[PDB]
């Protein structure tokens, strides 16, 4: 339920499966181009464990689709995002999300 688009080719042969932590430098943005989130401002890679649904499912599925070391662009609809409820005070309800995902490494 998401759309991906590669930006810069990386491995193209390895896929992130269960058992290894997924490490990204992502940059989420609003539908109108209003940047709200990133990791390079924090200057630290974001590590999250694939499998227990701790992150949003659109991001999870997009990261599962795209390979290792390959800079990507994602697009999460409100149906796969926070949607009607919305993130409190950050993301308005029923907002389209755009992600400048960079899966830099696994583990």
């Amino acid at each position: 339920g998401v759309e991906i688009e590669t930006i810069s080719p990386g491995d193209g042969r390895t896929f992130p499966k269960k058992g290894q932590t997924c490490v990204v430098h992502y940059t989420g943005m609003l539908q109108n181009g209003k940047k709200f989130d990133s990791s390079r401002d924090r200057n630290k890679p974001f590590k999250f464990r694939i499998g227990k649904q701790e992150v949003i499912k659109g991001f999870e599925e997009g990261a599962a689709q795209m390979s290792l070391g390959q800079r990507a662009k994602l697009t999460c609809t409100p149906d796969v995002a926070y949607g009607a409820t919305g993130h409190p005070g950050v993301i308005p309800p029923n907002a389209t999300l755009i992600f400048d995902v960079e899966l830099l490494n696994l583990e």
């Binding site: 688009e5 930006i7 810069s8 940059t27 990133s38």
Partner: protein, 903 residues
């Protein structure tokens, strides 16, 4: 509602001085091809993604000033409609990215090749990545101005310009018919890599404030001579029709006799033994009488220029003789000078200027004829391709060819002068090449208002590197950015281009400088004196007074100000390091004076008058213009009526006026698929909003333009019409033609009111007010218009997420000009709900105090950053092309205004 902040990198653009364009009778070719190589690109040197775009841009509005700007800062190629770019995955124009398919599409990586093609014969910009075509072609973009290669880049990139020929190899066969951009280089100059128009450059002693740059124009490549047809040939000219031809029948032949190009009886001209000094009777008859009527043609040029002849002294025929010199001796029918001989004769400067423009009108007719036979310019000569290195107008020609043309006709006018016939100069008419853009002439520089001084003896130096137009002195902090220095009371400035001091008029003072001179400005607020010094010498007024000004009130303060005219470079030395000053010890040090910034750790921040129009609200005390806001009546909606205060009075300000509302409207993000009482559910489910403007009686609709503008519309035109509206269409298809996506972009969506009037014989001043309304559909991006309650054929369609400002452009012709009516129509919601989310369910029109009419002043103040990017531009090699290097990162905090979409 609240301003947003972010950390944004610094983006700069580097261009080669290769300018191309098309016009009627153009001397340039319509197809050009150039490439860019990528050596090293750092993806994320900082938090923000590295910027890198390549493509073309336009010389008449693309000024990417460093720092904040339209959109989200870091403006480069594609951020507006004056440039066309390709980042590696999208086509960039009007600050909108549109994805494009490529065989292995990715953002521009190290060791990649981009093939950029421009066609000027028909609007089309094709792009290829590593030779693989990209299915994107720009269409329907204006040809006015000049086009040039340009690269927009943030820090951390190393790119190479490949221009072909001696300036590159392209590593790929260029498409046929596309001449490499290295062949457009002019002979008077040499190819180099320079940034876009700047206000500062590094200097060996210190940074130089760089005045506006003179820019070449497409109109300067069309040769426009004076027509030499409708001239009846006079008797005194047919009387001298012969000698002035006989003297130019072999004048070009005289130089080379008794050399390797020495004539022979068997052959004739153009056979590497050309001269044939005998006579033109031996020479062929058509070119013979052609040479006669070319002598007549030069005399006809003299007539059209304003030259007339009169005979006074002894006839030169008597006191002239032919000299059989030992040189130029020939065996073919005796020896003689190849032209007709002449004795000692001289020429005055009037004749020098006249023969200069006479050669100009010869060159421009020759170039016009060649163009009419299809030829064009190329720095390398190609005869089968019909291109020449000398097909440029005379003003752009090289000095060698200028002299070579002028020599022959100088001999001709000399021979005319020998016979005593006067060469009469015509009348003198002063003309200016460019007049409309009076503001892109001087770039005022002043310090921050925080450093304003109220006392003490302050001194600073401004080095006048050139001898052009520069003004330096002191001024109050409220200096208007679009008013000349000294024209008002808000400046005490000195101009040493003509020995002039400016304060509320003109009065002689001192002497003009020369190149390299340093002007040290003295000031004593305690003693109420202002003095100027030049190269350690105190400037003198036209009396015993040695002070520029006296009896000055302290007021709100004064500030060190300097300005620079076109083509000017000047160093400002506020004296942060006292040793930097050269003449301070000579003058000022022993007088107790101090440098302006003597004890300041950081260099004083300077502000320059930015030459970029920005919509800002009208001052309430505007002498000429006024906006009337009246409360909405039960029968009429609230309106914003514009009234000209001083119309019909003496010395009124009349000029083209640009107006817009202060708030925009945004379309829906996704477009939908595929008596007199409103319908309650239609009025709640409608997505089209209406406003109108009531063009009052006495205002001519032929000079009224009504419509919409996007916030990036930054064009100021005194003679505005719908032809100059910026537009471009991105056209996309699959890998084999089949164009399936054609989206149009424009900064102005506006309809001329002159097409909405009754085409009567007379009575153009309508007694009934013309009420033109504009309607926008957000759910589809559809723009429609109503003339007098009936729809017109004009309509527009745009992409979602676009913001359009209600704009009415008009040249006033009455005391009552226009009136923004915030009305409504049946089952159509007024703009009061479109502007404000809180009023989205309110059908009643309302005019809240935030919404107010803005007008476009071309010049506004701006800040230059305390640091600038460091770019290394050099010629890496003939095959390597020109290499651009920039690695040091610089980031700035940008405050983004949301509703105006600018930071």
């Amino acid at each position: 509602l609240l301003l947003q902040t972010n950390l944004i990198n610094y983006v700069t653009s580097i261009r080669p001085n290769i300018f191309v364009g098309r016009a009627e009778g153009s001397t340039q070719y319509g197809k050009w091809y150039f490439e860019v190589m990528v050596d090293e690109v750092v993806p994320f040197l900082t938090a923000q993604a590295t910027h890198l775009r390549v493509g073309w841009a336009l010389t008449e509005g693309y000024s990417p000033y460093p720092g904040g700007g339209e959109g989200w800062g870091g403006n480069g190629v594609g951020d507006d409609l004056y440039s066309y770019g390709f980042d590696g995955l999208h086509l960039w124009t009007g600050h909108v990215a549109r994805p494009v398919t490529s065989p292995g599409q990715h953002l521009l990586a190290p060791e990649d090749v981009v093939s950029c093609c421009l066609d000027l014969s028909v609007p089309s910009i094709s792009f290829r990545i590593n030779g693989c075509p990209v299915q994107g072609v720009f269409e329907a973009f204006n040809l006015d101005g000049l086009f040039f290669p340009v690269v927009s880049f943030s820090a951390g990139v190393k790119v190479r310009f490949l221009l072909g020929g001696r300036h590159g190899e392209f590593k790929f066969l260029p498409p046929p018919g596309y001449a490499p951009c290295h062949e457009a280089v002019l002979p008077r100059e040499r190819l180099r890599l320079e940034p876009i128009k700047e206000y500062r450059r590094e200097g060996p002693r210190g940074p130089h404030l760089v005045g506006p740059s003179r820019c070449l124009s497409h109109t300067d490549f069309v040769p426009c001579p004076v027509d030499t047809v409708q001239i009846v040939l006079p008797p005194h000219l047919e009387r001298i029709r012969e000698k002035l031809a006989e003297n130019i029948h072999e004048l070009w032949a005289l130089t080379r006799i008794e050399q390797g190009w020495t004539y022979g009886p068997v052959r004739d001209d153009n056979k590497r033994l050309h001269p044939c000094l005998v006579n033109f009777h031996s020479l062929p008859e058509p070119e013979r009488n052609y040479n006669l009527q070319m002598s007549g043609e030069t005399l006809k040029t003299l007539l059209a220029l304003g030259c007339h002849v009169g005979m006074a002294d002894e006839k030169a025929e008597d006191n002239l003789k032919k000299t059989k010199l030992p040189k130029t001796y020939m065996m073919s029918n005796g020896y003689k000078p190849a032209p007709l001989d002449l004795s000692h004769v001289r020429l005055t400067p009037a004749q020098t200027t006249l023969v200069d423009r006479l050669a100009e009108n010869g060159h421009n007719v020759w170039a016009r004829d060649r163009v009419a036979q299809g030829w064009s310019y190329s720095a390398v000569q190609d005869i089968p391709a019909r291109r020449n290195p000398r097909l440029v107008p005379y003003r752009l020609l090289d000095e060698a060819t200028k002299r070579s043309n002028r020599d022959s006709l100088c001999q001709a006018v000399r021979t005319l002068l020998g016979y005593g016939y006067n060469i009469e100069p015509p009348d003198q008419e002063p003309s200016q090449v460019e007049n409309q853009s009076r503001w892109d002439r001087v770039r005022i520089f002043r310090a921050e208002k925080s450093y304003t001084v109220q006392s003490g003896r302050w001194y600073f130096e401004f080095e006048a590197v050139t001898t052009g137009e520069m003004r330096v002195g002191w001024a109050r902090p409220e200096l208007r950015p679009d008013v000349e220095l000294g024209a008002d009371e808000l400046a005490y400035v000195f101009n040493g281009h003509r020995g002039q001091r400016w304060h509320l008029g003109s009065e002689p003072f001192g002497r003009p400088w020369q190149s390299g001179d340093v002007v040290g400005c003295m000031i004593d607020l305690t003693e109420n004196t202002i003095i100027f010094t030049l190269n350690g010498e105190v400037l003198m007024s036209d009396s015993g007074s040695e002070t520029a000004f006296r009896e000055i009130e302290i007021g709100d303060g004064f500030l060190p100000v300097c300005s620079l005219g076109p083509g000017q470079v000047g160093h400002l030395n506020l004296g942060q390091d006292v040793s930097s000053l050269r003449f301070f010890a000579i003058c000022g040090l022993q007088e107790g004076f101090e440098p302006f910034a003597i004890n300041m750790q950081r260099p004083v921040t300077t502000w320059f008058s930015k030459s970029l129009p920005q919509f800002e609200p009208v001052p309430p005390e505007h002498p000429h213009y006024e906006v009337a806001r009246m409360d909405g009546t039960v029968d009429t909606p609230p309106c914003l009526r514009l009234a000209h205060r001083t119309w019909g009075s003496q010395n009124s300000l009349v000029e083209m006026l640009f107006l817009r509302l202060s708030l925009p409207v945004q379309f829906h993000q996704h477009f939908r698929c595929t008596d007199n009482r409103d319908d309650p559910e239609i009025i709640l489910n409608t997505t089209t909003y209406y406003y109108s403007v009531r063009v009052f009686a006495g205002q001519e609709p032929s000079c009224v333009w009504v419509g919409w503008v996007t916030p990036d519309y930054h064009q100021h035109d005194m003679n505005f019409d719908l032809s100059k509206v910026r537009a471009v269409t991105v056209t996309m298809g699959d890998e084999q033609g089949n164009v399936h996506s054609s989206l149009k972009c424009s900064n102005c969506y506006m309809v001329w009111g002159g097409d909405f009037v009754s085409p009567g014989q007379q009575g153009r001043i309508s007694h009934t007010d013309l009420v033109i309304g504009c309607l926008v559909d957000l759910a589809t991006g559809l723009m429609t218009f109503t003339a007098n309650g009936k729809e017109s054929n004009t309509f527009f369609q745009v992409e979602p997420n676009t913001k359009l400002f209600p704009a009415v452009f008009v040249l006033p012709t009455h005391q009552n000009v226009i009136q923004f009516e915030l009305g409504k129509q049946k089952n159509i919601m007024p703009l009061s709900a479109a502007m404000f989310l809180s009023e989205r369910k309110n059908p009643a029109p309302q005019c809240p105090p935030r919404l107010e009419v803005q007008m476009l002043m071309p010049v506004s103040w701006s800040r230059m950053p305390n640091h600038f990017l460091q770019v290394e531009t050099r010629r890496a090699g003939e095959r390597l092309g020109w290499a651009v290097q920039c690695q040091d990162p610089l980031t700035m905090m940008a405050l983004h205004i949301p509703e105006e979409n600018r930071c």
